[PDB]
Structure formats: C-alpha cells, structure tokens
Short mmCIF file of C-alpha atoms in Angstrom, two decimals:
data_model
loop_
_atom_site.label_atom_id
_atom_site.label_comp_id
_atom_site.label_asym_id
_atom_site.label_seq_id
_atom_site.Cartn_x
_atom_site.Cartn_y
_atom_site.Cartn_z
CA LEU A 438 -16.63 -6.73 23.76
CA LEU A 439 -15.01 -5.46 20.58
CA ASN A 440 -16.79 -1.83 21.08
CA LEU A 441 -16.27 -2.30 25.22
CA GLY A 442 -12.54 -1.63 24.84
CA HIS A 443 -11.18 -5.43 25.26
CA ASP A 444 -11.57 -8.06 22.50
CA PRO A 445 -11.47 -11.43 25.00
CA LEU A 446 -13.56 -13.73 22.80
CA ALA A 447 -15.14 -16.47 25.13
CA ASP A 448 -17.42 -19.41 23.77
CA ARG A 449 -18.60 -22.56 25.71
CA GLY A 450 -20.18 -25.47 24.59
CA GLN A 451 -23.49 -27.25 24.63
CA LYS A 452 -22.66 -29.82 27.00
CA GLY A 453 -20.91 -27.32 29.51
CA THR A 454 -17.88 -27.80 27.26
CA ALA A 455 -15.28 -25.06 28.02
CA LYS A 456 -13.67 -23.40 25.13
CA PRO A 457 -12.79 -19.95 26.46
CA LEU A 458 -9.03 -19.15 27.00
CA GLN A 459 -6.94 -16.07 27.10
CA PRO A 460 -4.49 -14.61 24.26
CA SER A 461 -1.81 -11.77 24.90
CA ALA A 462 -3.87 -8.76 24.40
CA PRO A 463 -2.50 -5.50 25.89
CA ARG A 464 -4.14 -3.95 22.82
CA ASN A 465 -3.09 -6.18 20.09
CA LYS A 466 -0.76 -9.40 20.12
CA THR A 467 -3.26 -12.04 18.09
CA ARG A 468 -4.57 -15.16 19.37
CA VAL A 469 -3.27 -18.59 17.99
CA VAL A 470 -3.57 -22.29 19.28
CA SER A 471 -3.32 -25.61 17.42
CA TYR A 472 -4.47 -28.89 18.77
CA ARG A 473 -3.56 -32.07 17.14
CA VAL A 474 -3.45 -35.83 17.24
CA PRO A 475 -6.01 -38.29 19.10
CA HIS A 476 -8.03 -35.37 20.59
CA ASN A 477 -9.32 -32.61 18.43
CA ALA A 478 -7.32 -31.75 15.27
CA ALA A 479 -8.52 -28.04 15.37
CA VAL A 480 -6.12 -24.93 14.92
CA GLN A 481 -8.01 -21.47 15.95
CA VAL A 482 -6.08 -18.72 14.53
CA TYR A 483 -7.43 -15.44 15.39
CA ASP A 484 -6.02 -11.84 14.57
CA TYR A 485 -6.72 -8.45 15.74
CA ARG A 486 -7.53 -5.10 14.48
CA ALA A 487 -7.02 -6.08 11.23
CA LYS A 488 -7.97 -9.66 9.61
CA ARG A 489 -4.78 -11.35 8.51
CA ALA A 490 -4.51 -14.45 6.79
CA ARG A 491 -5.90 -17.18 8.46
CA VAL A 492 -4.63 -20.43 6.64
CA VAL A 493 -5.91 -23.61 8.13
CA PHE A 494 -6.58 -26.99 6.66
CA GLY A 495 -8.13 -30.16 8.15
CA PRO A 496 -9.38 -33.55 7.14
CA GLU A 497 -10.95 -33.58 3.92
CA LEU A 498 -11.23 -29.77 4.12
CA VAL A 499 -9.12 -26.33 3.66
CA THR A 500 -10.13 -23.02 4.99
CA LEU A 501 -8.20 -19.55 4.07
CA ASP A 502 -11.22 -17.09 4.24
CA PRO A 503 -10.96 -13.49 5.48
CA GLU A 504 -14.95 -13.51 5.54
CA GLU A 505 -17.18 -10.77 7.09
CA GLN A 506 -20.80 -10.13 6.51
CA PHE A 507 -21.99 -6.49 5.56
CA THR A 508 -23.40 -6.60 9.28
CA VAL A 509 -19.99 -7.39 10.96
CA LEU A 510 -18.40 -4.35 8.79
CA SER A 511 -21.02 -2.39 10.55
CA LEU A 512 -20.50 -3.60 13.70
CA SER A 513 -16.74 -2.61 13.23
CA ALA A 514 -17.82 0.63 14.60
CA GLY A 515 -15.20 0.03 17.73
CA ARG A 516 -12.66 -1.23 14.96
CA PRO A 517 -11.47 0.97 11.99
CA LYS A 518 -15.12 2.09 10.34
CA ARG A 519 -17.67 4.58 10.12
CA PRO A 520 -18.65 6.32 6.66
CA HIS A 521 -18.05 4.93 3.30
CA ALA A 522 -14.39 5.37 2.78
CA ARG A 523 -13.71 3.72 6.13
CA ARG A 524 -15.75 0.85 5.16
CA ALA A 525 -13.55 0.31 2.17
CA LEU A 526 -10.28 0.92 4.01
CA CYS A 527 -11.50 -1.79 6.57
CA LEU A 528 -12.11 -4.13 3.60
CA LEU A 529 -8.47 -4.24 2.15
CA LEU A 530 -7.29 -4.10 5.68
CA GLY A 531 -9.25 -7.49 6.37
CA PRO A 532 -11.86 -8.70 4.23
CA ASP A 533 -12.27 -7.84 0.45
CA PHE A 534 -14.75 -6.99 -2.58
CA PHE A 535 -16.43 -3.86 -3.28
CA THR A 536 -16.37 -2.81 -7.10
CA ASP A 537 -15.99 1.06 -6.94
CA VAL A 538 -13.47 2.54 -9.10
CA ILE A 539 -10.08 1.04 -9.68
CA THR A 540 -9.33 -2.34 -8.23
CA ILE A 541 -5.93 -4.49 -7.91
CA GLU A 542 -6.29 -8.20 -7.21
CA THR A 543 -2.90 -10.06 -6.52
CA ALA A 544 -0.95 -12.10 -3.91
CA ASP A 545 -4.32 -13.11 -1.95
CA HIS A 546 -4.99 -9.68 -1.69
CA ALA A 547 -7.94 -7.20 -3.24
CA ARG A 548 -7.80 -3.57 -3.28
CA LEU A 549 -11.35 -1.51 -3.62
CA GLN A 550 -13.01 1.86 -3.71
CA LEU A 551 -10.41 4.47 -5.09
CA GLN A 552 -11.07 6.78 -7.95
CA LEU A 553 -8.36 6.91 -10.62
CA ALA A 554 -9.19 10.57 -11.43
CA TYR A 555 -8.58 11.43 -7.59
CA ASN A 556 -4.91 10.45 -8.73
CA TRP A 557 -5.60 7.14 -6.88
CA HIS A 558 -2.59 4.47 -6.76
CA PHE A 559 -3.20 0.84 -5.65
CA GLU A 560 -0.76 -1.66 -4.52
CA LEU A 561 -0.52 -5.10 -2.93
CA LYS A 562 2.95 -6.73 -1.39
CA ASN A 563 3.03 -10.40 -1.78
CA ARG A 564 2.32 -13.10 1.11
CA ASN A 565 4.99 -15.00 3.29
CA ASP A 566 7.23 -17.99 2.47
CA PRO A 567 5.28 -20.56 4.56
CA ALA A 568 2.23 -19.40 2.61
CA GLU A 569 3.73 -20.51 -0.67
CA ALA A 570 4.87 -24.05 0.78
CA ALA A 571 1.25 -24.37 1.57
CA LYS A 572 -0.17 -23.33 -1.64
CA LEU A 573 -0.49 -19.63 -1.96
CA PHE A 574 -1.42 -18.42 -5.62
CA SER A 575 -1.62 -22.46 -6.84
CA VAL A 576 -0.48 -21.89 -10.53
CA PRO A 577 0.81 -19.23 -12.70
CA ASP A 578 -2.48 -19.45 -14.86
CA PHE A 579 -4.50 -19.44 -11.79
CA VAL A 580 -2.91 -16.02 -11.14
CA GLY A 581 -3.13 -14.73 -14.40
CA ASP A 582 -6.80 -14.96 -14.72
CA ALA A 583 -7.19 -13.79 -10.94
CA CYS A 584 -4.74 -10.80 -12.22
CA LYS A 585 -6.59 -10.19 -15.56
CA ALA A 586 -9.24 -8.02 -13.51
CA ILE A 587 -6.62 -5.26 -13.39
CA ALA A 588 -5.82 -5.26 -17.40
CA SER A 589 -9.67 -4.81 -17.76
CA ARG A 590 -9.63 -2.19 -15.05
CA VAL A 591 -6.35 -0.07 -16.35
CA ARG A 592 -8.28 -0.09 -20.09
CA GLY A 593 -11.56 1.07 -18.31
CA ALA A 594 -9.91 3.44 -15.98
CA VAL A 595 -7.48 5.57 -18.10
CA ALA A 596 -7.16 3.75 -21.80
CA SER A 597 -11.24 4.60 -22.45
CA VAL A 598 -11.89 8.02 -20.29
CA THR A 599 -8.86 9.80 -21.96
CA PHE A 600 -10.02 9.03 -25.48
CA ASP A 601 -13.24 10.84 -24.82
CA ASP A 602 -11.58 13.94 -23.33
CA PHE A 603 -9.47 13.89 -26.41
CA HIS A 604 -12.68 14.30 -28.74
CA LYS A 605 -13.90 17.05 -26.05
CA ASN A 606 -10.63 18.82 -27.02
CA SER A 607 -10.86 18.19 -30.74
CA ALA A 608 -14.35 19.72 -30.60
CA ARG A 609 -12.54 23.08 -29.81
CA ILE A 610 -9.19 23.09 -31.26
CA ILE A 611 -6.35 20.81 -30.42
CA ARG A 612 -3.30 19.25 -31.99
CA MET A 613 -2.22 15.60 -31.50
CA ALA A 614 0.84 13.98 -32.56
CA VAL A 615 1.80 13.08 -28.73
CA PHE A 616 -0.66 10.20 -28.77
CA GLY A 617 2.09 8.57 -31.13
CA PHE A 618 5.30 8.05 -29.30
CA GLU A 619 5.08 6.33 -25.81
CA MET A 620 3.46 6.23 -22.37
CA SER A 621 5.67 3.34 -20.95
CA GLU A 622 5.83 2.39 -17.18
CA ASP A 623 8.91 1.84 -14.85
CA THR A 624 11.57 -1.25 -14.44
CA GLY A 625 14.64 -1.31 -12.42
CA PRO A 626 16.38 -1.84 -8.77
CA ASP A 627 16.18 0.67 -6.23
CA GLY A 628 18.56 3.43 -6.75
CA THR A 629 19.40 2.04 -10.21
CA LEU A 630 15.77 1.91 -11.93
CA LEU A 631 13.76 3.44 -15.00
CA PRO A 632 10.97 5.44 -13.99
CA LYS A 633 9.50 6.50 -17.16
CA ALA A 634 6.42 8.72 -17.09
CA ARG A 635 4.77 9.78 -20.42
CA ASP A 636 7.18 11.98 -22.16
CA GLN A 637 10.00 11.33 -19.37
CA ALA A 638 12.37 8.77 -20.15
CA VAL A 639 14.81 8.51 -17.38
CA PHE A 640 17.15 5.69 -16.21
CA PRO A 641 19.80 6.19 -13.66
CA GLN A 642 22.34 3.10 -14.37
CA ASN A 643 24.58 1.90 -11.51
CA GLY A 644 26.82 4.27 -12.87
CA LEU A 645 25.47 6.12 -15.67
CA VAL A 646 22.41 8.23 -16.08
CA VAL A 647 20.10 8.11 -19.14
CA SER A 648 17.30 10.62 -20.00
CA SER A 649 15.39 11.70 -23.10
CA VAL A 650 12.33 13.74 -23.69
CA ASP A 651 10.92 15.14 -26.96
CA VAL A 652 8.54 17.59 -28.33
CA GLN A 653 6.02 16.95 -31.00
CA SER A 654 2.63 18.62 -32.81
CA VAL A 655 1.24 22.05 -32.98
CA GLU A 656 -2.47 22.76 -34.72
CA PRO A 657 -1.45 24.34 -37.77
CA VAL A 658 1.67 22.26 -38.46
CA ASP A 659 0.20 19.15 -37.16
CA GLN A 660 -2.33 19.07 -40.04
CA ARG A 661 0.39 20.20 -42.32
CA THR A 662 2.61 17.55 -41.24
CA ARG A 663 0.04 14.61 -41.70
CA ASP A 664 -1.03 16.16 -45.03
CA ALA A 665 2.74 15.72 -46.25
CA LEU A 666 2.89 11.98 -44.95
CA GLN A 667 -0.14 11.19 -47.01
CA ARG A 668 0.81 13.49 -49.85
CA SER A 669 4.04 11.19 -50.46
CA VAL A 670 1.76 8.25 -50.90
CA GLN A 671 0.42 9.98 -53.82
CA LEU A 672 3.77 10.49 -55.72
CA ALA A 673 4.20 6.60 -54.90
CA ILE A 674 1.19 5.67 -56.95
CA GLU A 675 1.82 7.97 -59.32
CA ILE A 676 5.27 6.56 -60.42
CA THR A 677 3.76 3.13 -59.49
CA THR A 678 1.33 3.62 -62.54
CA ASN A 679 3.89 5.00 -64.84
CA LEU B 438 -3.48 6.24 31.37
CA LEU B 439 -2.00 7.54 28.37
CA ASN B 440 -4.01 10.91 28.61
CA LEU B 441 -3.34 11.06 32.52
CA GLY B 442 0.04 11.43 32.16
CA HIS B 443 2.16 8.12 32.76
CA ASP B 444 1.78 5.21 30.66
CA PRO B 445 2.35 2.25 32.92
CA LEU B 446 0.19 -0.61 31.14
CA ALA B 447 -0.97 -3.17 33.67
CA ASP B 448 -2.94 -6.47 32.66
CA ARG B 449 -3.78 -9.45 34.84
CA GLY B 450 -5.17 -12.75 34.12
CA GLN B 451 -8.59 -14.45 34.39
CA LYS B 452 -6.98 -17.04 37.02
CA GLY B 453 -5.70 -14.00 39.08
CA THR B 454 -2.58 -14.47 36.99
CA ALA B 455 -0.34 -11.47 37.31
CA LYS B 456 1.06 -10.19 34.29
CA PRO B 457 1.75 -6.16 34.96
CA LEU B 458 5.17 -5.04 35.17
CA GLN B 459 7.02 -1.99 35.15
CA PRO B 460 9.43 -0.33 32.42
CA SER B 461 11.88 2.56 32.67
CA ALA B 462 9.49 5.17 31.91
CA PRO B 463 10.52 8.91 33.19
CA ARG B 464 8.46 9.88 29.86
CA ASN B 465 10.02 7.58 27.34
CA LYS B 466 12.42 4.67 27.14
CA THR B 467 10.64 1.47 25.70
CA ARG B 468 9.10 -1.77 27.55
CA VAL B 469 10.81 -4.81 26.24
CA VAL B 470 10.95 -8.43 27.96
CA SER B 471 11.86 -11.69 25.98
CA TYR B 472 10.68 -14.97 27.94
CA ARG B 473 11.79 -18.41 26.51
CA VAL B 474 12.52 -22.01 27.00
CA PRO B 475 9.93 -24.35 29.21
CA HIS B 476 7.87 -21.64 30.65
CA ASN B 477 6.26 -19.33 28.35
CA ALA B 478 8.07 -18.35 24.96
CA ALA B 479 6.58 -14.83 24.42
CA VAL B 480 8.29 -11.42 23.87
CA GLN B 481 6.50 -8.71 24.91
CA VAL B 482 8.25 -5.54 23.04
CA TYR B 483 6.35 -2.05 23.64
CA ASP B 484 7.22 1.13 22.46
CA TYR B 485 6.31 4.67 23.84
CA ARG B 486 5.38 7.90 22.08
CA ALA B 487 5.53 6.22 18.46
CA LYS B 488 5.17 2.85 17.23
CA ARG B 489 8.44 1.26 16.49
CA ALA B 490 8.89 -2.06 14.39
CA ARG B 491 7.92 -4.73 17.18
CA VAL B 492 9.60 -7.55 15.24
CA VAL B 493 8.38 -11.01 17.15
CA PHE B 494 8.08 -14.71 15.88
CA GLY B 495 6.86 -17.80 17.65
CA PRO B 496 6.05 -21.44 17.03
CA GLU B 497 3.95 -21.64 14.02
CA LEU B 498 3.16 -17.69 13.63
CA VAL B 499 5.01 -14.49 12.97
CA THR B 500 4.12 -11.08 14.17
CA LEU B 501 5.61 -7.56 12.72
CA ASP B 502 2.41 -5.12 12.60
CA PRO B 503 2.47 -1.44 13.82
CA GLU B 504 -1.30 -1.94 14.21
CA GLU B 505 -3.90 0.70 15.41
CA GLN B 506 -7.51 0.88 14.73
CA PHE B 507 -9.17 4.21 13.57
CA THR B 508 -10.47 4.47 17.25
CA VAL B 509 -6.98 4.02 18.99
CA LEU B 510 -5.91 6.69 16.46
CA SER B 511 -8.39 8.87 18.17
CA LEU B 512 -7.75 7.83 21.51
CA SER B 513 -4.11 8.95 20.82
CA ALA B 514 -5.35 12.78 22.16
CA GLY B 515 -2.59 12.67 24.62
CA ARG B 516 -0.36 11.35 22.20
CA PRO B 517 0.78 13.23 18.92
CA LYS B 518 -3.01 13.68 17.58
CA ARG B 519 -5.93 16.06 16.73
CA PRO B 520 -7.14 17.43 13.53
CA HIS B 521 -6.55 15.49 10.11
CA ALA B 522 -2.78 16.43 9.63
CA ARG B 523 -1.83 15.59 13.03
CA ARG B 524 -3.82 12.10 12.48
CA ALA B 525 -1.72 11.58 9.31
CA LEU B 526 1.53 12.81 10.90
CA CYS B 527 0.65 10.34 13.82
CA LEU B 528 0.46 7.43 11.16
CA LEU B 529 3.63 7.55 9.53
CA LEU B 530 5.30 7.88 13.08
CA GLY B 531 3.80 4.87 14.28
CA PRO B 532 0.81 2.73 12.31
CA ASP B 533 0.27 3.62 8.44
CA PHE B 534 -2.03 3.67 5.43
CA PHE B 535 -3.96 6.76 4.31
CA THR B 536 -4.39 7.50 0.81
CA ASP B 537 -4.55 11.31 0.44
CA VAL B 538 -2.32 12.40 -2.04
CA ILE B 539 1.42 11.80 -2.59
CA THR B 540 2.72 8.15 -1.08
CA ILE B 541 6.14 6.60 -0.71
CA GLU B 542 6.21 2.88 0.61
CA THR B 543 9.79 1.61 1.30
CA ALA B 544 11.91 -0.13 3.93
CA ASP B 545 8.87 -1.43 6.07
CA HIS B 546 7.67 1.89 6.45
CA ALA B 547 4.64 4.23 4.59
CA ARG B 548 4.24 7.90 4.01
CA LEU B 549 0.68 9.26 3.99
CA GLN B 550 -1.04 12.44 3.46
CA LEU B 551 1.20 15.00 1.48
CA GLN B 552 -0.11 17.54 -1.25
CA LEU B 553 2.50 17.35 -4.04
CA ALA B 554 1.33 20.76 -5.27
CA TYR B 555 2.25 22.26 -1.72
CA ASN B 556 5.84 21.34 -2.43
CA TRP B 557 5.92 18.38 -0.53
CA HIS B 558 8.53 16.00 -0.28
CA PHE B 559 8.50 12.15 1.27
CA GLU B 560 11.38 10.27 2.50
CA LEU B 561 11.75 7.20 4.35
CA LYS B 562 14.94 5.64 5.75
CA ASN B 563 15.92 1.83 5.81
CA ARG B 564 15.72 -0.31 8.52
CA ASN B 565 18.46 -1.94 10.79
CA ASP B 566 20.95 -4.70 10.29
CA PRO B 567 19.07 -7.03 12.78
CA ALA B 568 15.89 -6.60 10.87
CA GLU B 569 17.74 -7.68 7.45
CA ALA B 570 19.13 -10.74 9.20
CA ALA B 571 15.44 -11.43 10.32
CA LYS B 572 13.92 -10.92 6.77
CA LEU B 573 12.93 -7.40 6.47
CA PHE B 574 11.86 -6.76 2.70
CA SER B 575 12.09 -10.52 2.11
CA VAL B 576 13.15 -10.54 -1.47
CA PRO B 577 13.97 -8.04 -4.34
CA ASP B 578 10.88 -8.57 -6.43
CA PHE B 579 8.76 -8.19 -3.14
CA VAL B 580 10.19 -4.74 -2.62
CA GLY B 581 9.62 -3.83 -6.43
CA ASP B 582 5.55 -4.64 -6.35
CA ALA B 583 5.66 -3.09 -2.79
CA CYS B 584 7.34 0.12 -4.32
CA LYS B 585 5.61 0.24 -7.70
CA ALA B 586 3.19 2.65 -5.71
CA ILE B 587 5.53 5.14 -6.10
CA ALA B 588 6.23 5.24 -9.68
CA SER B 589 2.26 5.31 -10.25
CA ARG B 590 2.08 7.91 -7.83
CA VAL B 591 4.97 10.10 -9.61
CA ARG B 592 3.02 9.66 -12.62
CA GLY B 593 -0.39 10.78 -11.30
CA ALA B 594 1.24 13.48 -9.10
CA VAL B 595 3.44 15.43 -11.52
CA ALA B 596 3.63 13.65 -15.12
CA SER B 597 -0.33 13.89 -15.40
CA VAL B 598 -1.07 17.41 -13.91
CA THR B 599 1.25 19.33 -15.86
CA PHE B 600 0.26 18.03 -19.09
CA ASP B 601 -3.07 19.64 -18.43
CA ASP B 602 -1.48 22.90 -17.30
CA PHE B 603 0.30 23.14 -20.79
CA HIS B 604 -3.07 22.45 -22.34
CA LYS B 605 -4.22 25.62 -20.19
CA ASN B 606 -1.10 27.80 -21.43
CA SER B 607 -1.23 26.89 -24.89
CA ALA B 608 -4.87 27.67 -24.75
CA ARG B 609 -3.93 31.40 -24.48
CA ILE B 610 -0.40 31.44 -26.22
CA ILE B 611 2.73 29.59 -25.02
CA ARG B 612 5.92 28.56 -26.51
CA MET B 613 7.18 25.14 -25.92
CA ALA B 614 10.40 23.10 -26.96
CA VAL B 615 11.71 22.87 -23.05
CA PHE B 616 9.44 19.74 -22.90
CA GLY B 617 12.12 18.12 -24.94
CA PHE B 618 15.63 18.43 -23.16
CA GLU B 619 15.46 16.62 -20.01
CA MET B 620 14.00 16.91 -16.29
CA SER B 621 16.14 14.26 -14.44
CA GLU B 622 17.07 13.74 -10.97
CA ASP B 623 20.43 13.38 -8.57
CA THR B 624 23.04 10.94 -8.19
CA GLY B 625 26.42 11.04 -5.98
CA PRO B 626 27.80 11.12 -2.51
CA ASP B 627 27.62 14.11 -0.02
CA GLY B 628 30.00 16.94 -0.94
CA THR B 629 30.45 15.44 -4.28
CA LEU B 630 27.14 14.48 -6.04
CA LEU B 631 25.08 15.57 -9.00
#
C-alpha cells in the first residue's frame, strides 16, 4: 500500500477481531490513538513519510524505538529510498545506524553517511519538552558516553588525516609554524556571536566588533626561527655551568 | 490533479464518510479549516504552490512538518520541479534536507544545494509572531545547536579551501601578509550600516 499511493494500514485479529481504523491522510498527517483504563492500555502512534519518535510505555515495559529492518529500508522504495545516499538519508530521517564516515549522535538522534573530505557537516537539533519530562537523555553522564562517539570521530576525521598530509608536504618542502597558534570553534548568540575559523578571529558584540588574524612561518626563516629558539637554551646552559 | 491543472484535493471515508470540501483556488489562495469542540478536534491546513508551515497541535500530539517523500518531490512535476537544481529549489521552497554544498539552518528553515565557489549566498528570514507565541525556536540553546551547522559549514566552505589555494600559490611564488589584518563582516541599520 505504501508504494500503491495511499498508506491506510489495516490489521485484523485471529478471532475475527477488528483493529483497522482510518487516520487523516490526504498525503500526511500522522496516525495516533491512545486507549487506556479497564479495556486495553495500548497507544498506537504511527508517523508517515519519516519515522518520528514514537514514545510509548506500558505496564512493566517501555518502548521508544525507530526500528526498521534492512529489508524494510529496501521496501521504502515508494518512500524516500533508492541508491546508497538515499538509503542513508532515509535513515537519519527515520531510523538510524550506518557507520560510513563522520557521525554525530545527540538528543535521541543519529547522523550517518557523510564524507568529511567532501566538506560535509552534521547537525541534530534537540527533542521536545514533553520528551524531557518523560526521560529523554536520562542523565548527563548517559549523554556523555553517547556523545563520546563524536569526539573519537572528529579525531579520526580531521585531527589524524591532516597529520599525514603535513607529512606529504614536508616530504617535498613546506614551512610550518601555523600549526602552533589556534584552530578554535564558535560561541555566541545570533547577530552577536564569535564565529572563529582557523586564523580568523571575529566577534561582533552587541555593539562592538572584535577581529584578529595573524601571519607566521616561511621555509628559510621558519627553520632559522626554530634554530634561534633552541640556541637561546644553549647560552642558558652555558651561563648555568659558570 | 496537481498536474491536470487544478488542485482540488478530495478524500472520502471508509464508511461512506464525506470529507472533501472546496477551497478558494483560482490558482492559489490556500486551504484552511479548523474544527473543534465535541465533534472532531482537527484542523487541516493546506498550502498551495509551496509548502508553508502547517503548525497544528492536538490532544497528546503536536505536528509541524513540511514533509514530502522523494517520490512526491518527483510527482511535483506540474509544480516547481524537473532537473537537480529545481528539485533542491523546490525543497527550500517547501520541504528541506539535501546536503550538497553550503547550508544554512535558521528560523524553522533549511537551505540546500548551493556551491560557495559559484559565489552562492544563502538567507532565511525569521518566522511570524503567532509562531513564536506557539513555540517556534523553543529555547536559545536549541537554536544554537541547530545553527551550529552553519559554523561548521563556513569553516569547510571558505576557511579550509582557501588554505590549500594559498599553498598552490606559495608553491610557485606568492607574498603573504594580507592574511594578517582582518576579513570581518557587516553590522548596522539600513542607510547607516557597516
């Protein structure tokens, strides 16, 4: 039915039990229903197009799972899915998990398949207020470990690769002091933030603009500079001996 | 019907329930309706041409989704969509999400597909007052993380690429002190800015 054009989703029961109903679905508008009290404490929350967080806990059990099998991912043809990219894109849209290149896990989300080299960025906005009151990211430490995946990633995405490139360059010529000032990141509110980017220190305050950029190293003088620094230590030892 | 020329949008119900109605649509003029109280608390807001923010929250649930499947994007032939560009252009016009090159996420919006090298600029004007009173960008921190995507982008779009070009130039000749003064940005009101 998903591929047919209109997803209705019906399902009867063994004893001729009738469970199919009708949601508001001109194209998309979810499918929710929550029965409680002496009857059948069961809430069936169903989302369309994507796979929104279906938080639902019952007696002695708690379910909050995106869940989809690699076969379903395939069956999602009439949905957003075809080659590799679309598969992954379908994941972070609904399900998750697919270690390809860079990854970012945060706020009950997971980002997969994106080559850092291909100037790829990742982001995952937080959940909602009712989700927090429910549990969400349980405890800070819990979030720490879950987020640790990003720290290891960044170290394996840029911090390591670049080191090898520096080696390639130094295997030809190169000059390098610029790997001794800063690299930083950003901090600050909209319209008044600090978007630092390598040797580009800017900070447009609420009513003031701060900026700074510097220049260093040049093959012949870089070595000569380093040599100078190491020589001063010699003189120090010399006067120390006397 | 979208391709046929006039989008009416009808849909009956299993038990012969009648749900199709008629909006004001000479070409475009939306389709809104909000039923409440002991009857059927359901408001169906439908936009035409583009995919405006359909904010709508009900008992125990809240929906505010552009939502469109890659198949719908394709079906949007009689709408604004054909090759790659138009697809992306159709996205930021209605739906969203498509990491191509530069990206800017802000005020419940998303900008996709635009090569910085091709002197491409991105922009996304804020929402409306009633949207704020509803929730909008919930809390500042929330907006920070959502916007962090831009910081990483700019660093990967210009801050990194240029560094390599400087290397290419320095591999021939070059002189370079100009990478030690400033680069800045703008600040100020119209007709009196910096």
